Design a protein around this ligand. Structure first.
Ligand SMILES: *[C@@H]1O[C@H](CO)[C@@H](O[C@@H]2O[C@H](CO)[C@@H](O)[C@H](O)[C@H]2NC(C)=O)[C@H](O)[C@H]1NC(C)=O
Ligand SMILES: N[C@@H](CCC(=O)O)C(=O)O
Ligand SMILES: N[C@@H](CCC(=O)O)C(=O)O
Lengths: 495, 91
């Protein structure tokens, strides 16, 4: 098992989808991990926020799998269990560092398992990308918080997106799991609220053979009238479904979600099959300081990561001197600046999370041990319950880069420990052949799309809507075998 | 102690064996090695049974109550590995 363990006065837990158990995640995982460690270094180098407290880290692979993430969550937990616990001469083995607070994120299912295992140890947990509405509940997940808004706000944004184009008749597909099911249920409720019908609902499983996805594709083609499919999937399932839909001679205008996000590697090599896609993302503002820090990184100056070598040899497809015969050997001048490095949108969220935790600790330090800037007897024992309930949940500090224009500088949690609901909408339009996303609008509660800048798939507004609003006042509506939508029959003038 | 927190600590005492094997002394590290529990009989007060069931769910260790009649434990979602020879409370 590969880990990161940097010791200090206090240590934060690190949960990321570094691997996909499979292959290394290139954007979601490693950029977020580097950002977290960068913020940790900034904390351990500054002088106004925990100056005398050196903040360490313990970061572990999740593989986007419940059982595996649970095993490294148990690795986090071992520290509190070993406290009550001998040896003939000296028994060290591994010394599990006492985690002050776990910055645990990635998908919703992993975060829910981590919250379940950490609630029993009253260890605070801050997420950065998990957005399931289930985690808003405090009955089972009281000690869970996150700087991202819950799922049902995103579902409401999706329903508004649908009703802006009058897409009354749409299909939808979600990933079989807690996140996909919960979010798609919320979005379907919003759709029935806005009188926006649905065609089909399909589930593919968090991990499945390439038999479910093509069946879902055939189901989506079983209703040609519905040119719009609402996709609410996790990132890996989105990748698999896009690959499957490209396998068949098919295309659509995919209404995507946060799991799709502004991700490029998900659609890698498959621009056409998802060209008119509409994707929502939790709006943010990237950090230039992290940009320069991350670009300054090299495998020679980065021994802090067990994966950075494999990350480099995957992203650039060139092997180091380890083998030198698989594909190629990296030149000595390889870099990141001009290369295809678009830092993930959800980086600053990650960073904010850590700082929130840091500030909480700072406030707790200013309360438990205000006489000195030390981890004295009052503070050397972590009061996770009190830390979470009195410092974490109530944290009101300006954004780390309020010098940059940010009306939403205040990181203010709701009563349930969630962030502001403020989203960006993207379409995968063409710019230069190797085209990418760019912002087509923003949303707080009222849409701000721009139809002109959409540049749709079939060079035209998708008319995924079914026949017409039947207007029974002049022609009544009937559903012979078409339960979804209606067909009009001109009512008699004498009836 | 008919308490959630104290029974939770002894539940940890149950649990602080699984993480031991996966975890190197100078000569030996063995004072009182806890044993992995094939199955836990834990019951009486409902809150205690719920907390112990939450802890055991993460370890697929079956837990059988003997008196906790709470219908909340009837929920097999978060109390999957739970069982009880006592009927639920709605009766
Ligand atoms: C969605 O449907 C509504 C009405 O059902 C459209 O609203 C009208 O559209 C006509 C042209 O089709 C305009 O002349 C009117 O100004 C609109 N009136 C009202 C009260 O809305 C709406 O345009 C449709 N949205 C899109 C993108 O086509
Ligand atoms: N909310 C998504 C994950 C978002 C992300 O990976 O950034 C699921 O769970
Ligand atoms: N079901 C009761 C306890 C039953 C008992 O103590 O015998 C409460 O909870």
């Amino acid at each position: 098992r590969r880990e990161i363990k940097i010791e200090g006065d206090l240590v934060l837990g690190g949960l990321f989808p570094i691997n996909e158990c499979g292959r290394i995640n290139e954007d979601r995982g490693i950029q977020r991990l580097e950002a977290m460690l960068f913020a940790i270094d900034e904390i351990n180098k500054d002088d106004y926020l925990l100056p005398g407290v050196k903040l360490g880290v313990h970061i572990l692979d999740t593989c986007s799998r419940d059982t595996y993430a649970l095993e490294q969550s148990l690795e986090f937990v071992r520290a509190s269990l070993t406290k009550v616990d001998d040896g003939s001469y000296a028994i060290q083995e591994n010394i599990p560092l006492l985690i002050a607070g776990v910055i645990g994120g990635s998908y919703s299912s992993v975060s829910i398992q981590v919250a379940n295992l950490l609630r029993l140890f009253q260890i605070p947990q801050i997420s950065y990308a998990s957005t399931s509405a289930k985690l808003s509940d405090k009955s089972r997940y009281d000690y869970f918080a996150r700087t991202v808004p819950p799922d049902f706000y995103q579902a409401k944004a999706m329903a508004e997106i649908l009703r802006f184009f009058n897409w009354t008749y749409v299909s939808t597909v979600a990933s079989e799991g807690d996140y996909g099911e919960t979010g798609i249920e919320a979005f379907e409720q919003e759709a029935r609220l806005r009188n926006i019908c649905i065609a089909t609902a399909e589930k593919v499983g968090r991990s499945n053979i390439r038999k479910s996805y093509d069946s879902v594709i055939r189901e989506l083609l079983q209703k040609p009238n519905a040119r719009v499919v609402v996709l609410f999937m996790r990132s890996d399932d989105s990748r698999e479904l896009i690959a499957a839909a490209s396998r068949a001679n098919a295309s659509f205008t995919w209404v995507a979600s946060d799991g799709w996000g502004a991700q490029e590697s998900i659609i890698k090599g498959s621009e056409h099959v998802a060209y008119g896609a509409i994707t929502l993302e939790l709006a943010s503002q990237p950090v230039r300081q992290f940009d320069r820090y991350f670009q300054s990184l090299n495998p020679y100056n980065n021994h802090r990561n067990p994966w950075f070598r494999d990350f480099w040899e995957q992203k650039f497809q060139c092997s180091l001197q380890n083998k030198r015969n698989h594909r190629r050997v990296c030149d000595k001048h390889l870099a990141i600046d001009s290369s295809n490095y678009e830092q993930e949108s959800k980086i600053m969220f990650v960073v904010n999370a850590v700082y929130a935790m840091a500030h909480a600790l700072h406030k707790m330090q200013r309360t438990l041990c205000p006489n000195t800037t030390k981890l004295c007897d009052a503070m050397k024992i972590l009061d996770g319950k009190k830390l979470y309930k009195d410092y974490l949940l109530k944290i009101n500090f300006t954004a780390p880069f309020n010098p940059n224009k940010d009306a939403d500088s205040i990181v203010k949690f709701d009563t349930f420990g969630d962030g502001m609901g403020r989203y960006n909408v993207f379409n995968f339009q063409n710019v230069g052949g190797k085209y990418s996303y760019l912002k087509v609008g923003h949303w707080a509660e009222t849409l701000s799309l721009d139809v002109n800048s959409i540049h749709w798939s079939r060079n035209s507004v998708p008319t995924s809507q079914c026949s017409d609003p039947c207007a029974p006042n002049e022609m009544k509506n009937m559903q012979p075998g078409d339960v979804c939508c209606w067909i009009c029959i001109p009512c008699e003038p004498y009836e």
